[PDB]
Each structure stands twice: as structure tokens, then as C-alpha cells.
Subunit: 301 residues, 6 copies
């Protein structure tokens, strides 16, 4: 009777944050697949948490089985390191596109709700003051700029999923804009996750989104009250936290003193999900320092 | 000994015209795959022409075998009908991308020269005065406009090929700009090749039907006679000194830049000169319901190539060729 | 050391009652496959009970591994709902026959005991007074009566298994005749096991819904308490001296021969005795919209078995078991 | 535009006689698959006859390709030899059912007309005065009589095809009743087509071997000359106004109703009239070892068809055709 | 963070002794696959011991996943029973070579350290005083002596691994020379590990059965206590600065050099001292029905290793361990 | 009715000579598979010659279909170039063993006669005076000498075939000893058939390039004219009353027993007699760089009714004659 949520790549930034919220705030069962459990801590001991081992490129039977068993499908496995797009464009395509296509097709076959991570980068060099999921044009560079294979792969997957939507697939696309929070993803981790630049730590701006706001929108998508999220595409970002790299540096140091254009349009996200981001840039970063104080070891790695 | 050219989807516009030039002007052997031969006429009786049967979505072993056998690989099979992009986007992805990828991957495996039909559509809503294959940005609409699945499939394919190029694949991408001539592909033929709009307009003229113009036919296009298209293709296949390896060429005549309305008027005027068409053409009503110029600098310089045919010669050649084959012209839009 | 019994589709009527008997009366290990465990209660907690997850149409490797590991193989997964035969005949074939064949073939490959649920329906419109698994002819209606795809699929599987038997497969076929008891499978559960007619009547009765008597409801059938069914299965699994190898057993009580009408009336009269049912049952009308008696002589002598439960005992047990689980009862037809 | 007919298992009795009619009386194209051509006479020469090599159990790609290419699909490959049903029941299931199913599914996928050889045996031990494809019940013996695996495999294939018909498959099932004529398939040839008893009896006769009658050879059967068989098929393939779509036709001559004893005697009487046969025919004794009328009303009415050849006409044709081909006749039982 | 060691075929001689030493003397994690855990004792309790179920011939996905997950890959599954080489050489090839090749290939793909059990038998009838892994010639009998398919399959695997080493594969081959100790694998267990001749002799001794000496039992061999074997394996798996990468190591004690006859005598003589063995030992008849010294110079010097255990100390160790498990000793030859 | 002989890798030395013998002396049908026909001359125009296209690593369906169709199965496709064993051992294994295994398994399934080219190399460093297929030990070097992956792959295949023989497979193994004749396979052609040492010596001689003599070139070998090799093969394919079923035959002329140096000198002397080769041949020097190999053929002679007729000298003279209007094809032997 309880809703079953399938998270592929659950040891990630998103997976462990989403699992926590689910276990703590609902009666849903979590089916979570990954290779390691190091980001989950105590979640795995929870009686509605069901971790299992597998890789989407290898455990095809075990993955398909859980797609049939579950109600809502989150395939979160994906290469999302900008350095890899340039150096090994083919690895990006093989994992983010080719390895995920069967999982999409299983969600179709078994009539499930596919909640898929598109990308904030899908807009590319779009010039709109606000990136509109229903309206903005999508602009990439020429073929001889291979970094664009990431955006192009994600866009094609969006259109393939949209195509299946035209034939009856219940899907929601979401595009996270620079989610940040405790438990940041490791630079080389194969998951849609956290903002790289913030871990590492100049006038390029981006919209930073505290993870709790991101997760809240996701919960509403999974709950899908009245089927409102079906067929829809949502930017999940805080456009009020549009800060430059210099500003990030300066605020992070000003915050560390206490302890011893790519703007997402989110109108449809707010209205349709009854959602609004609560965390200011300042709140967001304060939260990350409060969290990592003990674990200086986990920070470096 | 002789160079071997594999054409997947040979029974049609590019298949016919390319095979013809190859047989008549080189010692190369042609291996052409398709389901039927009714567009090849007498080419099959030539000793250097090797037609064989197969379908790229079915005959995987027989196709791969030919990729290992041949030197140059041209996979022309694809849905390239604008209406289908909107109504059936999944079928466009499945065939144009998904079913061509194993062919690309065989070309990688056996060290062959992959000569792949990219598309003029890949530039999308590009604002550049000339679409430049080494420089222009590529712009599509949002996900809720599914017609863009074609340009997006074709883009991702160009990038996957580019990624193999970075690992040693010998490839050339070509982007035909509105190739037109005798033996146009039927509107629903799943082959890269001939300008659909010109084909559609020709079918209307000969059936005596109205020609419908969106936004008063303001859309401008660069029209290219097939002989010009083929000559650039020949140079790519020859690949003197490896000059075409790693390259992307628009193959178009930027000097034949006309609006869709100008195209309709010109074809209507031309139809009236021919007694085979005039009477159907008389019945045609033009009814009512932005700039796409190819840069061809690299194409002309690297390949020693220049387009020779004006808009006028192009269309005339077309009307000449169909005059005793009006039934063929009429069936172009069925 | 100990016998390992593999049950595929363990989470239901047969899986539950059998497993229980195995755990309480033998030293055998039970390996049970299904998607959920809600029909197994605390059985999973027992050290000789090994539940594992999978679907026969998906987990090919995991199922075959278990066929190699275990000694006796009971593949229970099957659409066995009459309504479904008529409306989705292909689903019945795909699951009951096609998805079960690889499992049969692994039992062959690894030299296991295949204990396979055939069906009392295999006899079809047989005219014999007693359905004899070694002698009775098997009669179905024409192709335009798709209801018979179920019996025909099951007959073909029995013949395939028999063909494997000719080549050395150790098999036993069993044909349950309307097994009934606690934990009936709900009507769309895709498992061989419980009498659908008794299950649907129970559901409708507890819901105060009218009952359908097809063709006046004079078709006579034989009803069997689950404990009698299970006792016989236990004998088959133990297979003392190889007595059940190559054999085909009807498991049912021929003395419990009642018509559909008689069943409905009996169940109505019984429900009136219980406080949980009497109110809803009073609201039940019978609505109008030959003999199927099993020979069990070989089953009796070869397995040293005899059914113990009368019709009344059986139905009584069922009503008692559901008194505290009225929602389970209501859900049987959901 | 011309209709394309696909025959899998073309090199034999049906493939030869069907192909000949098609080529002689229509503009349709034949695509015929087999391993050899020795039974096709001079047909291959015909420019509308397209023979190709392959085996339905091996050449999956080449078979699927031709299914997509063609309009009408006749899969004739099947073990149809009564002795093999008994001794090798698994091979019968594997070829007749399991290897034909992917062909049925390709016909579904590509929207083709599947014209499938069901069997006269599907009725089994039916008691009806005439075997009615829309109504007659179907009765086989028990599982311990494996001969029934042929009829049961064929029945299930019919129900699977029927299930696909419910989802939109354009099919016609046909059941030939002992078709006979020149070019009989030898007894161990795996194709549906010719009467094996007639073929075997001819074998013995030409070889001077005794003919065996079982249970006194009293069983009546309907015998059909091949030309009447083909005329029905042609009407099916033509499918005037879609009338054959979703139908099941017995194709036989109910007026040619003869026992096995009578068949032997008539064949022996007839052989004595032929110099080439008489010396061998004299040595044949009938040795004792220890009714099947087709209803053809729907066939006659929907196809506008009537069987024209008497049993006597039919046998005379056969003896005439083999008269200067004694070796071939002897080979029918090898 | 911590090194992950994958052992395929863990429930046996090497598996138990290796996992124990890993858990006690490192912080590494063990991932061990097998069908059962009965040879693992209490090792499964350890938090760094991860038993999982599977068979390399079936659970392809689960095996490949663990190869990607783990750092060092030990595939121990193989028929290594001499009589089976003779009786079923195909089974030996299929398991030892064909079924292990995909495991090797995954180790290549994912960049892992392949630590592979080659065999002392690979030298065959080598005439060298010391079998040198870097220099000794490898000598087998003719094709009509099927016993050599074992050594031939193992040889080819070593050369295939060496080929992948040339391309970057990080491998180490190890060749155990008659490893012996508690927990000997039963004779028909398909795992590389323990000395079959010693296991067979112990089995007969405890069963009061005769011992067979082929050709007087004058064949000499080197015998190695298990702790000495494991110590070398630990160094290989630690692989300090890649010292064992690309290397081939015999792991034997050349000072324990005894004939089969001397082995039998010494085992019987030592059994007399044990009251649990003495009585069955007196019933044993020794009945009539080449030096094999490993060079270990590279093993000693590269790995910092030396065998500590004398032959007599090794046999007494074995006799002590089986003292309270006579059942287990007797099951060795079943 | 007529016997059907399947030759996989028909466009080369054995394919050509065998196909010719079959067409001229029997009523058998030849089904030959390759990528090209340029080594087949006129043969394809013959009504009992059926050439078809395919590659054993790719056209699995089309190859298996032909195995089922035909009666006798000759899979000739294999890397057999000594330099490639050392440079690319994996490719040798993959083609010679792995890609041939399914063909063997099809022959088992469809009850055919598998006639498999094993190799004289299978004996390895055998010390026997005559290499006996039924008795001689098989000796290779260590793992770190990858040249031995060829002999080891071919040995394992012979043992897998033998194992299927034990369960009923109709097989014959044949081991050519230095078959030499017109139409030599170039040294990089992936086919069993011709002596590489003779082929490379010819190639270098006609190109006026040095010839290498490994370890002084003292090792003696047996050299067999192709006609003698084909005569034995024909008897195997006919297989009258199953004489060849389950058997292993060396096919060589042990009377043509000459050292590698003797071969060089003999070829150089022969080259000097032909105007097309003489100028090139004068330029060749022998380069030394840092064990007899006699086939026993008693079973082959007595079982098959066979004996080699051609001397070393006739054999090489026939080769030199054949190539003299085809100098470019001789030079290509080592390209
Ligand atoms: Cl870039
Ligand atoms: Cl805010
Ligand atoms: Cl659109
Ligand atoms: Cl111009
Ligand atoms: Cl029905
Ligand atoms: Cl009773
Ligand atoms: Cl029978
Ligand atoms: Cl009549
Ligand atoms: Cl042996
Ligand atoms: Cl010592
Ligand atoms: Cl070497
Ligand atoms: Cl001689």
C-alpha cells in the first residue's frame, strides 16, 4: 500500500538527502541502489530503507525488477564533471544517455512515474533573462566544442522522454541549479548532485540553491497531488541567490570568521508544487560550515 | 585493389546520382544496400555496381560484413520528413540515431572512412549570416516542440562521431543544403537526400493542387543542384592527402538563395513552358497560412570545389527530366 | 545435506500452506521466490525458510542459479483467472507457457525433480464419469473460444514436460481440483492454487454483492481442503522409492461433488451463522446468466494418501479463518 | 505496387504448385526460401520468382527482412510425419511451434497478412459428422500418448495467432485435408503440404513392399487434389474485400471420402494399368497390424470456391506424373 | 578506501584459509562467492567478510558487478580432479577455460589485479630438475590422451592472460604445488586448491579402503603446507609497488620432495599413532595398479617469502584437524 | 544427392587447389566462403562451384546455415604468421580458437564430417625422429614466449575436437608439413595452407632482400608439393567407409627432408636459372640470427592409400615456373 520510491545512485548528494526526507516525513518505502553506502550513514538501518547493490551498466535484471516493483523511478546515475565532457566526451554519452535509456523504457513498459534529472546546462548559451522550461531556446557551440556533448545528451534524453510522454508515459523532468549543502559530492562521482565550485573553496554568476529547498520540490513531484507534475518540466533553483565566484569567496571567508547570466525561471515550479525556496545564500553557506566543522577529513577528500 | 564505397540506402536520390558518377568517372566499386532497385534503373547492370538487399534495423550481420569489406561508408538511412518529426518523434530518434550508431561503431572497429550525412537543420535558429560548421552556435526550441528531435538526434550523432574522431576515426560529416535534381526521393522515403519543399511543390503542380505558403512563404533557403552536391561528395570520398579527414562541410550554393514564395512562383512559371505540365499548373492556386545561408569556404578550398548551377538551371533540369514521367512526379507526394 | 525445495511464486495460497507444512514436519530447506511477503506471515523468520525476490519474466540468472542449487522445483507462477483467458489470451500464454519453459529446461539441465502444477481444466469438456490422468481424452472448444488458451497452454506444457520425461527428466505433474482454505489467492493473483469460483463467491458474500450462476449454475465440481492438497504434494516431494517420477496426479476429493448452485447455497447458509457475515449475506441474490469428478485412484495407492476433509469441514474452516480479516475477504475480488 | 508473396519452405509440394499458379495467373511476386531448388522445376527462371537460401531456425535476420518486405507470409516449415510425433515429440514442438512463433510475431510487427498452415488433425477425435472450424470441439488423447503433441502444438499456434488477431493481426488459418498430387513431399520432409499415407503407399507400391493397415484400415478420410487446394489459397491470398481476414478454412473435398484399405486397393488397381508400376504392384500384399469429413461451407461461400477433382482423377494425375520418374517415387519413403 | 578482495569459489580450501588470514592480518575486505558456506566456519560473522551467492556459469551480471567493485580478483572455480579429465574432458575445458575467460575479460575492462590459479600440471612431463616458470619447457602427451586437456586449457588461459598483460593487464599467475592442510576440498569439488592424491589417500585410510599406486608409485612430488601457500598469496595480493605485476610464481616447498609410495607409507605409519585412525588404517592394502620439484627463487626473492613447514609437520597438522571430524575425512572421496 | 564440401576461407592456396581437384575428379559440390575471389581464377564459373561471401567472425547465421547445408566442413581461417604470434598473441587466439569454436560446435550439432586443419607446429620442440600423431609428446616454451600461443591454441582445439569425437563427432584432423605450390598465401593472409618459410624466402629473393637463418638454419624440415597434400585431403573428404573418422594425419613428404639453410641455397640456385629472378637473386645475402621436424606418415599412407610423388626439386621448380609471369605477386608475398 505504501508508495515505493526507486533511487538509482542513492549514495549520491541527492540520493542520501532525498532518502532522509522520505524516511523522516512520509510512510514511503525507499529502494536505493548503489555500489557503496558511505554517504548514507544510519539511513540503511531504517526499516523503510532498502539498500541494494548494483550498477546500471551491469545489473540489468536486478534494475528492471525494481522498476517493475516500484512506483516512482529516479535514475540519478550520470557523469556530471565539466572536465570529463571535454576530455572523454564518449564516456559522458555512454553513461548519461545510453545506459539510462533502458531504464526509461522499463518505466514506460511497467507504467511507472519517471522522475528524471535533466540539467540546468540544457539551456546552454540561452540569452533570456530567465531560463524558461516551456519557452527558452537551447543553444550550444559547434561540434568542435566537445564539452557540449553533455548538454546535447541530456537534451536528447529529455526529448526521448517527452516522446514517450506523448504515448502515455507518466514523467516529470527536473533541472537542479547548483544545489549545495552538507554531504557534498566528490569531484569524480557518477551522479547528478552538488555544485563543484563550492566544494573546491571571478564575476561569473550562478544561482545557488540550498539542498533542503531542492529536496522539498522533489517531494512534491513524487507526491504528485492531483497529477499536477505529470508531463511537466521544473527548474529547481533559487534565482535570488545569483552570486558570482568572487562573492562566494568573500562570503565564505566572512562566514569562516564566525567559527573557530543563468537565472532559473521557477514560476511553474512554485505554483504547481506549492513551493518556494526558503534558504538565502547566507543561510545556505552558514549551514555547510555548521555541518563540516567536525569532519575536516571528509572535506579534503 | 579498387576503392570500395558502401552506400546504405542506395535506392534513391543520393544513391542513384552518386553511384552513377562513381561508375562513369572512377574505377571504384559500389556496394549499395536497399530493399528495391526501381530508382537505380540501368546502374545495376554495370559490373562495378553491387546491389544487395537488406535493412539496417534487421540485417545486422550482412551490414557489418560490408563495413569490414568496404573502404568508405555512407549511411543514408533516416526519416527526414518534417511532418514525422512532430507526429512521430520517437521513430525519428530510433532510426536516425539509434539504428545508425552500430554502423558508426563498425566503421570505428574496422578503421574505415565514415562519410556521414549530417543536416542543414543542425544549425536550427542560428542568427549568423552564414552557417559556419566550425563556428556557428546551434539553437533549438524547448522540449515541448518535438520537431527539434530530428536536429537534436542529428547533433548528438555528429558529436558521437566527433568523439570517435578524437580516438582515431577517419570521418567526414557533410550537410547538404536543399539538394534538388532528377529522381527526387518521395516525401516519405526514409533517406537523407532531396529538398522536401521542392518535392512537395513539384507534386502539387503536377496533380494541379494548391501550393500552401506558411507566413506568406517568407522562409529563405539555399538551393543546390544535385550535380554540384555530388561533385563535393566525390572529393570527400577521394580524400586527396587526407584533407577531408576530421572535417565538416556544408554542401550548398549560397548564390541560389530564394524565398519559398519565390520558389513557388518560379516553378509555376517554369511549368507553363512545358505542355506536359501547363494544364495542371493552370489550376494551381497559391494560398496562404528566416535566412539559411551555408558558409562553404572550407568546402571550396579544401576540396577544390565550386557550385556551377544557378537556381534557373537547377529547376529547369528537373522539369526536363520528369516531362515523360509525369506519373512518377505525381507519386512523389503519396 | 537436507532436501532443498524451490517454490517460485511463494507468496500466496500454495506457497504459504506448503512452506508451513515443510517447516513444521520435515528437515527440508524452503527457497521461496516472490515480489512481496505479505502472505507468508512469520514463516520468513524460520531458519529453514529462505525468501528471495525476483520475477520469472525478469530475473533469469537468479532463478536459474536457484534451480541448480535446489533439488525439487515447483513453478507456481501463472495467470489462472477465467475472465483473463477471454480478454487477454496472449498474456495467459506468455506467462503460463512461455515464461515457464526456461524453468522446465533448467530442471532438465541440472537433473532436478520438476513438480509442476498442471490443471484440472486440462480435461476440458471430457465426458468420462471420472477424469483419469492416464486415460481420459482432452476436449476444448474451437479457436474462436479464446477461454481455451489456458487449458491448451497447460496441455502443451504437460506434453513438453512429458517429452523431457522420455529423455530422463524426473517430473511429477499435479492437477489441483478446487483447493480451498485460508489465504485464498485474490482473483487476479497470477498463481496456480485456489478455486476461483469459491473465492469470488466469498468476496461477493462478504461484500453483500449478487452472485452470478452461469448457465443456471448446474455444473458439478469437486472441492478439496488445502490440507488434503498439501499432504499429497508432500508425498510427491518426498518421492519415496521414486514412486512419483513420471506420474500425473489429480489431487482432489471426489466425494465433495457439488454444483455451483449448491456451493453458493451452502456458503450462504454458512455465512448466516457468523456475526461478521450474516448482515451482508442476506443481501445476496443468485442471478442466472456437466460433471468434473477426478479419478484419484493412482494418487491414493501410489502416494499412500486419502483426503480427510468433508465439504462442510472445508467451508467452515474458511469462514472461521476470515472472521477477523473481513477486509482480506472483501479484497479477494478487487 | 505488385503484391509480394513470401513462402518459407518453398522447395516442395505446396511451394511448387502455389508458385506456379501465382506466376501463371497473376502479376504477384514470389519470394521463396529453402535450402535447395530440386522441386521447383523451371520456376526459378521466371522473373517474378525469387528464390533465396535459408533455414527458419538459423537465418533469423534474412527471414525477418523478407517478412517486412513482403505482403503475405506463408510459413510452411513443420515436422508433419506421424512417426516422429511418437518418437521425437520435442522436435515436433520445437520446430512447429517454437521456431514458427518469431515469424508470426514479425508478421504482427510489420502489419502483414499471415496465411498459416493449421492442420486437419486439430479436430482430433471429434465426433461431428463434419469438422466445423467455427464450432467443432477438439479432442486429443492423454499426455501419455505423445502423438498428440503435433495437434496440440498446432492448436496452440492457432490460438496464439487468434489472440494476435484480437489485437489487429491480419491472418487466415487454413487446414488442408489430405492434399495429393504430383511432387509429393517425401515422408521425412519437414513441411506442411501433402498426405503422408498416400505418399507412403506409393513408396511401397513402386518398391514392391507390403502396405500396413492398422486396426484393419477402416478409418475414412477426405482426399483433395492439389489444384483444388491451390485455388482456395489463391482466393485467400487475393483476399477480395478482406473477406478471408480473421477466418479459418478447411480446404478439402468431402466427396472424396475413402478408407485406408480403399486407398491402398484403388492405388493398387490403378498401378496395374501402368507398365512402369505393374510388376512391383503385384507383390504388394495388405497386412493387418494392431471418420474425418471437413465442413467447407464458409470456405465455399466466402472464397467463391468449389473442389473439382474426384479421387479417381487425383490418383490418375499422380501415377501419370511419376510414370517416367520411378526413382523419385521410390525416394518418397527414404 | 580499504582494499577489496574478490574470491570466486570461496567455500573451500583456499577460500577459507585465505579469508581467515586476510581478516586477521590486514584491514582488507573479502567478497567471497559460492553456493554454500559450510566450509567457511565462523568467518562469515566477521564484519569484513561478505559472503554472497552465485555460480560463474549462471550469475554473469552479479559476477561482473563484483569484478568492477573489487580490487583484486581470484577465480578459483575449476574442475581439478584427474579422473574427470579422462572421462569428461569437455567439462574441464568448458569450466576451466571458457567460463573463466569472461572473468579475466572484466578484470581487463575495469583495470583490476587478476590473481589467477595456474597449475603445477602446466609443466607436464618437463625433464628439468627444477620447474622454472620463466624458462622450463611445457610437455604434454598426444591428443588421444585426453587427460592433458586440463594442463592444455590451463596453459592457454595463462597465455591469454599474458597477452592481456602485454596490453596493460595487471596480473599475477600462481602455481600451487600440492598444498595440503585442514579443510581439504573433496575430490569432486570444482575448485583449485588442495592436493587430490593426499586427499584421496586420507579418504581411503579413514574408510579402511585399499590405496592404488599407479606404476609402483615411484613418481616424486613436492608437498606444501597451506600456511606457506597463503603467506605467498598475501604478498601477491598486497603487491607492494607492483612487484608481483606480470609475474608467474610457483608456490611450493621443494624440500618436501617425496614419491607417491613414500606419501602412502608415511600417511599409514602416522595414522597408526592416532586411535581414531588406527583401526581403519590396519585394513588398508597398498596395491600396484619423474621428479616434480618447483623452482621458487623468484617467489622467495621478489615476495620476501620462504616455506617454513616440513612434510611431517604438514601431515600431522592434517591428522590433528580431522581427529574430531572422521565424517568429513570420509566424505573427501564421495 | 551429391556430396557437399564447405570451405571457409576458400580464396587462397588450399581453397584453390582443392576446389580444382574436386571439380575435375568428382561429382561433389563446393561451397566456398571468402571476401574476394581473386585467387580462384576460372573456378567460380563452374556449375558445381558455389562461391559466397562472409566472414566467420561476423556472419554467424550465414556460416551456420552452410554448416547445416553441407556434408564436409573445412574451416581454413586462422592467423598462421609466426611474427604475429609474437606481436599480437590475443588476435591469434581470438581467430584461431575462439572464432572457430562455433563452427566446430555446428558440425557436432548437425552431424557433419569436420575436417580440421591442425598444424605441424603442434609437436613443438618434440625430439622424436618422426613426429607421430598417435604417440609423440607436445613441447612448447614458457608463457613469456608468446609465439607458442599459436601451437597451444591449435592443440586445445584438437583436444576439444577429440572430446566431441568421444561423444560421436565425425572428425578428421590433418597436419600439413610445409605444403608448397603455385598460389602461395602471402604471409599476412589469415589462412591455414602454405609453408611461410618457403613463401617469405621466395618473396625476399624476388625482391633482392636478405634471408634470415634462425640459429644457423641447421634445423631440418619436410617439404610437400601441394598436389601430394591435396591427394591425401581428397581421400579424407571421400572418407570411404569411414576410414578417416576419428583419425589424425600428418600430410607431408618425409623424403623431402632439408635444413632451412639448404632450402635457401636451393631456392637461390633455382632463381639463378630464370631471367625474371636472376638479377634480384644475386643480391641476396644470408643473415644468421641468434632439431629435425620429420612427419611420421604411416597411418596416412596405409589407411588412406596415399603416398607423396613429388621431389623437393620438382616441387620448387614448379613454384618458380608458376610465378615467372607473376613477379609482382611473388614480391607481394611478403607485403
Ligand atoms: Cl569544448
Ligand atoms: Cl530566499
Ligand atoms: Cl514541434
Ligand atoms: Cl552559381
Ligand atoms: Cl471464450
Ligand atoms: Cl472426505
Ligand atoms: Cl502415442
Ligand atoms: Cl468432386
Ligand atoms: Cl588420458
Ligand atoms: Cl622446510
Ligand atoms: Cl616468443
Ligand atoms: Cl618422393
Amino acid at each position: 500500500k505504501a508508495k515505493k520510491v526507486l533511487i538509482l545512485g542513492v549514495n549520491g548528494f541527492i540520493g542520501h538527502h532525498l532518502s532522509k526526507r522520505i524516511l523522516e516525513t512520509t510512510d514511503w518505502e525507499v529502494f536505493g541502489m548503489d555500489m557503496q553506502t558511505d554517504r548514507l550513514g544510519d539511513l540503511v538501518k531504517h526499516e523503510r530503507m532498502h539498500f541494494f547493490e548494483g550498477d546500471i551498466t551491469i545489473n540489468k535484471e536486478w534494475v528492471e525488477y525494481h522498476v517493475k516493483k516500484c512506483d516512482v523511478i529516479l535514475p540519478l546515475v550520470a557523469i556530471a564533471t565539466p572536465a570529463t565532457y571535454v576530455k572523454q566526451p564518449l564516456r559522458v554519452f555512454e553513461l548519461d544517455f545510453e545506459a539510462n535509456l533502458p531504464i526509461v523504457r522499463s518505466a514506460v513498459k511497467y507504467g511507472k512515474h519517471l522522475v528524471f534529472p535533466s540539467t540546468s546546462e540544457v539551456y546552454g548559451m540561452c540569452a533570456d533573462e530567465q531560463f524558461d522550461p516551456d519557452a527558452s531556446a537551447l543553444t550550444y557551440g559547434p561540434i568542435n566544442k566537445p564539452r557540449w556533448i553533455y548538454a546535447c545528451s541530456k537534451q536528447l534524453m529529455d526529448r526521448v522522454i517527452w516522446g514517450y510522454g506523448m504515448e502515455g508515459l507518466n514523467f516529470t523532468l527536473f533541472r537542479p541549479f547548483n544545489w549545495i549543502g552538507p554531504g557534498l559530492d566528490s569531484i569524480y562521482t557518477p551522479k547528478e548532485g552538488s555544485s563543484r565550485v563550492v566544494t573546491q573553496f571571478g564575476s561569473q554568476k550562478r544561482a545557488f540553491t540550498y539542498v533542503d529547498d531542492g529536496i522539498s520540490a522533489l517531494m512534491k513531484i513524487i507526491e504528485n497531488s492531483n497529477g499536477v507534475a505529470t508531463g511537466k518540466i521544473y527548474n529547481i533553483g533559487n534565482p535570488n541567490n545569483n552570486f558570482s565566484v568572487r562573492e562566494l569567496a568573500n562570503k565564505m571567508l566572512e562566514l569562516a570568521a564566525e567559527f573557530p547570466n543563468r537565472v532559473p525561471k521557477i514560476e511553474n515550479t512554485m505554483q504547481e508544487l506549492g513551493w518556494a525556496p526558503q534558504f538565502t545564500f547566507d543561510d545556505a553557506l552558514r549551514q555547510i560550515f555548521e555541518a563540516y566543522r567536525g569532519h575536516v577529513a571528509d572535506a579534503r577528500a
